[PDB]
Amino acid sequence: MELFLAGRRVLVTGAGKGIGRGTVQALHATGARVVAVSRTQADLDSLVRECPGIEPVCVDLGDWEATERALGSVGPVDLLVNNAAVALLQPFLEVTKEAFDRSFEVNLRAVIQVSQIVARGLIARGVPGAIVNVSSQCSQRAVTNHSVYCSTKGALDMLTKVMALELGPHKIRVNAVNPTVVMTSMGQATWSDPHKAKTMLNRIPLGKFAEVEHVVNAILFLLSDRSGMTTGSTLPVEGGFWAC
Amino acid sequence: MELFLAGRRVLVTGAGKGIGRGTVQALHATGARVVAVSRTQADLDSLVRECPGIEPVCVDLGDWEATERALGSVGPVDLLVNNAAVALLQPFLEVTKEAFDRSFEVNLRAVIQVSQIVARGLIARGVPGAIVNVSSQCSQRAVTNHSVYCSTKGALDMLTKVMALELGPHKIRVNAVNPTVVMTSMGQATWSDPHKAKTMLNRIPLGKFAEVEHVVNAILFLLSDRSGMTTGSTLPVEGGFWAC
Amino acid sequence: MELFLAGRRVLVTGAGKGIGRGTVQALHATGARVVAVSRTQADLDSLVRECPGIEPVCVDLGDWEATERALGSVGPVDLLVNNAAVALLQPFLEVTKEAFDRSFEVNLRAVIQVSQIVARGLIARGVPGAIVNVSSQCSQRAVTNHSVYCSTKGALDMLTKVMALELGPHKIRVNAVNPTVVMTSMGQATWSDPHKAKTMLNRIPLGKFAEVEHVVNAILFLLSDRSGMTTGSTLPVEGGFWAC
Amino acid sequence: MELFLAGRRVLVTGAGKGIGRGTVQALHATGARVVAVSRTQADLDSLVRECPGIEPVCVDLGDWEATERALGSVGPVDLLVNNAAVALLQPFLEVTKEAFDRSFEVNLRAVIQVSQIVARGLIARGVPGAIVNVSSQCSQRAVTNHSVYCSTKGALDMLTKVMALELGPHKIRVNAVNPTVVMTSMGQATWSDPHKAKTMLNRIPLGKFAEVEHVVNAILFLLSDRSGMTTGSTLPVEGGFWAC
Ligand SMILES: NC(=O)c1ccc[n+]([C@@H]2O[C@H](COP(=O)([O-])OP(=O)(O)OC[C@H]3O[C@@H](n4cnc5c(N)ncnc54)[C@H](OP(=O)(O)O)[C@@H]3O)[C@@H](O)[C@H]2O)c1
Ligand SMILES: NC(=O)c1ccc[n+]([C@@H]2O[C@H](COP(=O)([O-])OP(=O)(O)OC[C@H]3O[C@@H](n4cnc5c(N)ncnc54)[C@H](OP(=O)(O)O)[C@@H]3O)[C@@H](O)[C@H]2O)c1
Ligand SMILES: NC(=O)c1ccc[n+]([C@@H]2O[C@H](COP(=O)([O-])OP(=O)(O)OC[C@H]3O[C@@H](n4cnc5c(N)ncnc54)[C@H](OP(=O)(O)O)[C@@H]3O)[C@@H](O)[C@H]2O)c1
Numbered sequence: 001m002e003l004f005l006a007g008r009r010v011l012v013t014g015a016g017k018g019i020g021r022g023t024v025q026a027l028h029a030t031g032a033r034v035v036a037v038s039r040t041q042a043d044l045d046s047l048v049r050e051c052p053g054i055e056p057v058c059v060d061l062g063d064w065e066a067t068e069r070a071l072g073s074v075g076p077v078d079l080l081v082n083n084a085a086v087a088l089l090q091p092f093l094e095v096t097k098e099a100f101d102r103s104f105e106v107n108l109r110a111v112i113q114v115s116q117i118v119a120r121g122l123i124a125r126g127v128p129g130a131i132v133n134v135s136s137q138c139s140q141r142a143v144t145n146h147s148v149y150c151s152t153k154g155a156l157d158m159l160t161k162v163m164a165l166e167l168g169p170h171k172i173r174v175n176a177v178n179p180t181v182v183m184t185s186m187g188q189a190t191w192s193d194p195h196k197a198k199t200m201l202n203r204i205p206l207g208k209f210a211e212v213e214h215v216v217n218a219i220l221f222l223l224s225d226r227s228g229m230t231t232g233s234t235l236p237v238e239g240g241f242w243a244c
Numbered sequence: 245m246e247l248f249l250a251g252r253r254v255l256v257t258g259a260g261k262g263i264g265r266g267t268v269q270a271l272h273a274t275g276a277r278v279v280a281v282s283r284t285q286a287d288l289d290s291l292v293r294e295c296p297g298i299e300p301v302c303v304d305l306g307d308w309e310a311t312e313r314a315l316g317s318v319g320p321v322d323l324l325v326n327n328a329a330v331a332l333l334q335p336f337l338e339v340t341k342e343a344f345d346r347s348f349e350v351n352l353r354a355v356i357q358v359s360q361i362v363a364r365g366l367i368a369r370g371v372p373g374a375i376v377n378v379s380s381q382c383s384q385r386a387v388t389n390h391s392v393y394c395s396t397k398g399a400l401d402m403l404t405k406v407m408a409l410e411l412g413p414h415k416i417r418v419n420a421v422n423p424t425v426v427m428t429s430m431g432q433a434t435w436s437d438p439h440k441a442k443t444m445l446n447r448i449p450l451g452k453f454a455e456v457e458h459v460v461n462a463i464l465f466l467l468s469d470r471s472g473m474t475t476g477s478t479l480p481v482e483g484g485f486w487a488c
Numbered sequence: 489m490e491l492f493l494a495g496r497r498v499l500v501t502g503a504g505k506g507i508g509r510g511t512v513q514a515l516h517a518t519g520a521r522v523v524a525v526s527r528t529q530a531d532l533d534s535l536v537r538e539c540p541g542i543e544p545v546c547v548d549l550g551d552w553e554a555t556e557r558a559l560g561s562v563g564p565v566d567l568l569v570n571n572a573a574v575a576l577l578q579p580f581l582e583v584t585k586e587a588f589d590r591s592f593e594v595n596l597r598a599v600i601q602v603s604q605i606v607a608r609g610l611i612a613r614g615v616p617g618a619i620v621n622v623s624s625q626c627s628q629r630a631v632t633n634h635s636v637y638c639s640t641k642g643a644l645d646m647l648t649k650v651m652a653l654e655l656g657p658h659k660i661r662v663n664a665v666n667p668t669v670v671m672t673s674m675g676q677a678t679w680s681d682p683h684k685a686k687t688m689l690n691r692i693p694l695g696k697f698a699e700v701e702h703v704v705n706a707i708l709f710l711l712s713d714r715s716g717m718t719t720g721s722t723l724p725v726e727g728g729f730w731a732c
Numbered sequence: 733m734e735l736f737l738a739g740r741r742v743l744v745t746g747a748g749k750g751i752g753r754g755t756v757q758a759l760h761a762t763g764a765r766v767v768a769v770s771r772t773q774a775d776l777d778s779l780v781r782e783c784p785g786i787e788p789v790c791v792d793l794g795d796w797e798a799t800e801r802a803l804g805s806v807g808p809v810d811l812l813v814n815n816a817a818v819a820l821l822q823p824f825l826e827v828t829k830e831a832f833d834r835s836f837e838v839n840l841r842a843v844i845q846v847s848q849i850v851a852r853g854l855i856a857r858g859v860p861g862a863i864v865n866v867s868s869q870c871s872q873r874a875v876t877n878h879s880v881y882c883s884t885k886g887a888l889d890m891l892t893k894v895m896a897l898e899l900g901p902h903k904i905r906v907n908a909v910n911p912t913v914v915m916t917s918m919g920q921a922t923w924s925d926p927h928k929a930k931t932m933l934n935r936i937p938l939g940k941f942a943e944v945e946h947v948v949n950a951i952l953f954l955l956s957d958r959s960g961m962t963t964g965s966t967l968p969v970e971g972g973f974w975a976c
């Protein structure tokens with residue numbers, strides 16, 4: 001199934017590691033032009049060696065002012081993957097103002113700002129496009145010590161819906177993907193305990209956590225014209241965790 | 245994106261018309277071996293002329309005993325699309341025992357029976373597979389005169405979930421697709437009035453009804469290993485109707 | 489908080505045992521006039537001794553023709569609790585035509601028929617009313633061996649929604665309550681194993697199953713004018729099971 | 733139905749106007765002791781005249797530091813209603829950093845902080861309690877120019893779920909209410925146009941917007957032991973808007 005992603009310009013946030021990195025790798029492989037945005041220079045340096053031709057942008061996306069300046073003259077961008085996020089885990093009764101603020105600045109505010117920059121561009125050019133927001137299984141199911149992170153992802157699901165409503169007339173589709181634990185730096189920080197992960201694994205009908213490739217495939221399908229009547233959705237990549 | 249559907253054996257119900265017909269057409273074009281099951285012989289005759297080498301099975305899927313007999317020695321089936329359904333529309337206070345019975349027999353009990361036949365075969369062979377159930381935007385939003393139809397589709401969503409739970413350990417994924425109005429015989433029976441369709445259209449961010457191709461694309465993605473951590477889901481093909 | 493249920497005429501199905509029995513008991517204590525409908529005569533005999541002045545109607549609600557005949561001259565009914573149901577548990581691959589048919593006949597088609605009888609009466613009289621459908625935590629989460637039962641309850645949720653839509657203009661509200669395990673004959677048939685119940689209990693934030701009183705309280709709130717802008721809803725009585 | 737709210741100490745945020753004000757009025761009428769928290773002194777002055785004995789606290793709840801200082805020695809609080817919110821409406825492509833920040837500080841961060849203060853108190857005293865979060869119909873359905881406000885409410889729904897999970901062991905229930913337009917200063921700012929409200933009204937089965945009394949009744953029921961197995965829920969007070 002040809003997705004018709006070849007030659008199109010794609011911006012990926014949180015491109016340094018895990019899902020964002022895999023997404024840049026897949027897009028570069030299929031002949032897309034990629035803008036790779038991430039917080040840590042070393043991650044972008046190695047990525048550009050692996051994927052020659054991608055345009056690295058090193059910026060902290062929790063910084064509205066710095067984001068605007070860095071994504072300033074990004075150029076035409078046809079397709080957008082909002083993947084950058086932080087998981088700042090604290091028991092509810094220990095949540096701090098600082099962890100709340102940081103989480104919403106990165107996981108949600110930056111989704112607004114980057115998507116605005118991309119959408120404005122598409123509309124000015126009079127051309128259709130697509131946005132995928134990387135949410136989570138946790139966007140619709142609570143997990144201990146994830147009050148902030150779950151709230152950002154629940155917010156992100158709804159944000160996705162409003163964006164879909166308002167951008168649909170401009171032929172811009174906006175979807176979310178919702179993965180279970182993916183063993184990456186985030187995933188194997190706290191799910192690295194074989195029995196903390198055990199209780200969750202028992203709740204997953206397919207009996208396993210998600211690979212980066214599972215998430216990337218879902219993102220690519222949602223970016224493509226193959227999903228041309230899908231907008232405002234939350235596509236689960238969690239092995240049936242939501243079902244039971 | 246290669247879906248790896250070439251050579252696999254696929255059974256599609258309600259193959260005679262609309263979405264099921266389009267699904268047969270797409271699968272045959274990609275090199276799958278198809279078992280086309282539908283109620284009306286003429287539909288199947290023409291489809292075999294269009295798609296030489298498909299195996300037609302003419303049966304009324306509302307008939308448990310006749311389905312068992314017809315789908316008896318169907319052979320190895322790796323993939324299953326449960327698409328046959330009836331939309332018997334009556335105001336709630338006019339709902340009849342007959343309309344209820346027929347609707348549940350075709351729209352749900354046949355999903356069980358045909359899925360058992362295929363699943364039992366997969367388990368005997370010890371091989372993975374996938375099932376797609378064609379649901380509806382109505383599975384989750386009520387529409388006047390659709391009390392029975394809405395209930396079958398709401399049931400079918402939850403059926404998809406239990407099937408996902410129980411078949412997951414056998415590496416069989418089970419997903420639903422949930423289209424808005426598709427202008428087919430069913431779609432353009434009652435949504436043929438330009439203002440009955442107008443109120444719904446105003447609720448769709450993408451400002452249009454779904455084409456058969458939109459639904460087939462989602463089906464083919466959910467059948468393929470590209471959607472390998474998606475099970476128990478309800479993938480909307482409704483232009484954003486659920487979102488707003 | 490006065491619910492203004494004194495003097496109103498209430499019909500309750502499955503009144504013989506568990507939740508329906510408790511509902512009759514509570515309503516009779518508050519001064520409602522109750523029509524108690526249930527399958528087994530002995531259950532109704534004892535309940536009328538406990539609750540003198542209730543009107544017993546012994547009928548099998550799975551029988552459309554017999555229900556029509558029994559609920560024929562029931563008289564003015566202002567409020568309706570659809571509680572009768574069967575839990576026929578079979579592994580998915582063991583589901584039978586008979587179990588499916590029985591389950592849908594009692595759990596759903598009877599909800600339609602009894603609701604039509606009451607609603608038609610309300611509309612003829614030109615007076616407002618309310619209907620409560622007793623659903624399940626299973627309406628929205630799959631449980632092994634509950635493919636049929638889960639599907640009836642998933643259907644019943646969506647039925648509640650269409651009924652709410654169509655009856656709203658007649659000032660008739662229609663809501664569902666969705667309890668977790670309630671230790672009654674149904675609840676303590678299969679959840680009687682202390683470790684089968686253990687895995688579910690660990691998923692309930694309140695760390696316990698529901699008492700009959702919990703469910704009756706939610707029913708009575710949804711019947712009263714206190715819930716006057718609530719219709720089409722699914723009120724969980726599951727200790728937080730859906731939330732996590 | 734006695735709710736057993738008499739004599740218990742209840743804190744209500746956004747008590748100055750609309751739903752929060754009605755809630756203080758109802759609680760004061762039933763004999764509860766009320767802490768009334770709101771931004772504008774004049775609103776609290778008049779409230780205390782209407783409801784002698786309530787403890788006014790004038791504070792901007794978007795200010796973490798000022799909140800901590802003001803709700804410092806509040807005293808024992810048994811029950812909590814988080815109602816303060818701002819609706820800062822902007823088209824998606826016009827959303828500003830300032831409107832995002834303000835909305836999340838008030839609508840969500842303050843819910844965290846106030847609920848922490850109350851919960852810590854309950855736990856220190858070893859006593860059960862209840863929290864109700866005033867969300868919205870918009871928490872699960874997108875509305876034009878409400879991207880920020882819808883995202884706060886979607887976040888609030890999820891927050892409610894995590895809080896329910898973590899506080900359930902401490903016998904603290906946490907629920908949300910989700911009203912449609914209530915004609916208050918917020919409601920009749922933008923829904924004051926008789927045809928902007930017309931499209932929404934047509935989508936409401938009960939054919940009307942919510943009164944303050946509808947919301948207050950739902951809050952009281954969720955605060956009471958009558959809803960003793962309900963936690964992590966989102967109780968709609970939107971006349972069936974979600975159903976169709
Ligand atoms: N694995 C899981 O448990 C899991 C589950 C469900 C959903 N998700 C979601 O999946 C997505 C990807 O997560 P992952 O597991 O791939 O995480 P990861 O391995 O931690 O990758 C996240 C990437 O985002 C970048 N990033 C974070 N904050 C940033 C900021 N302020 N500015 C610029 N870049 C920033 C990170 O950079 P630095 O490392 O340089 O900070 C990193 O390159 C997220 O949206 C996450 O919420 C993850
Ligand atoms: N089109 C829409 O508006 C819409 C919207 C939401 C969901 N859906 C769902 O999409 C699927 C496809 O519908 P469609 O629009 O393509 O409908 P269609 O054009 O009416 O085609 C339905 C096909 O299923 C077959 N079928 C029906 N009952 C059968 C039975 N008892 N045994 C064997 N075959 C049977 C029909 O055969 P005969 O014609 O010979 O009876 C027909 O070939 C269904 O599951 C439907 O509910 C459709
Ligand atoms: N308890 C749980 O675990 C649980 C959990 C989630 C949801 N629910 C739902 O809660 C409701 C009440 O169940 P329960 O636990 O109270 O069950 P129960 O203790 O088994 O009582 C069910 C009552 O309904 C009656 N009934 C069943 N079929 C009938 C028929 N065809 N015609 C007339 N009466 C009939 C039964 O009569 P006979 O006994 O004479 O057959 C019995 O009096 C149902 O809608 C059930 O699905 C229960």
Ligand SMILES: NC(=O)c1ccc[n+]([C@@H]2O[C@H](COP(=O)([O-])OP(=O)(O)OC[C@H]3O[C@@H](n4cnc5c(N)ncnc54)[C@H](OP(=O)(O)O)[C@@H]3O)[C@@H](O)[C@H]2O)c1
Pocket residue numbers: 745746747748749750751752769770771772775791792793794814815816817818838866867868869870910911912913914915916917918919920
């Ligand atoms: N009516 C609707 O359209 C509608 C619909 C669905 C849900 N809701 C929700 O219902 C709840 C009540 O809204 P309403 O219609 O009653 O609104 P309202 O009439 O505007 O009342 C909101 C109250 O909250 C107070 N408040 C706002 N920000 C505050 C802050 N930073 N610190 C302290 N107090 C603050 C307001 O004070 P000032 O006026 O002094 O700022 C006011 O007294 C909210 O959670 C709202 O989101 C409203």
